[PDB]
Symmetry: C2
Subunit: 97 residues, 2 copies
């Protein structure tokens, strides 16, 4: 029932892992090596994206927004977006079911 | 629209601040000085609690769980709990509005 987003971290590839799931949400960790891109990403429900460590750029619509450690964005359901890592980064993606 | 949990942090008092809210959630930052206690905390919706910086002990039921940086727990609505800060800590409390 406690999950540790900063244990088991790896930057040898882009890693996407569901760390926990309940009836309402999935809690997903993304480990992004510096320079990794996640393009055309779309989740089936509303999400929030938070940088636990590192720094990304996040694109949605015609916007491009830097997200240093601690930054959070929330999106409505099914909105297409892109993540680019500027450093090795650990992201929490919280997905509504 | 982008909120920055680690800007504007202060440890002179226990601080609870809604940094953003949308249709489904309020995103709340708790800044806890070392030694601060939030006891008998109960939220009206399902929550998740995650340590962004620091370290706390989280109690629920008869359990006492250590939460270092990065640890996350999720609770159903209305479940009573306690947070104790073992260091100056910044916590994200994500509160469902359902």
């Amino acid at each position: 029932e406690v999950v540790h987003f900063l244990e088991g971290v790896c930057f040898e590839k882009l890693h996407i892992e569901v760390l926990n799931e309940n009836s309402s949400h999935k809690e997903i960790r993304i480990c992004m090596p510096k320079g990794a891109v996640m393009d055309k990403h779309k989740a089936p429900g509303a999400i929030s994206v938070q940088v636990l460590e590192g720094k990304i750029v996040f694109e949605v619509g015609d916007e491009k927004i830097e997200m240093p450690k601690g930054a959070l964005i929330s999106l409505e359901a099914q909105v297409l977006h892109r993540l680019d890592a500027l450093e090795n980064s650990v992201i929490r993606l919280s997905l509504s079911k």
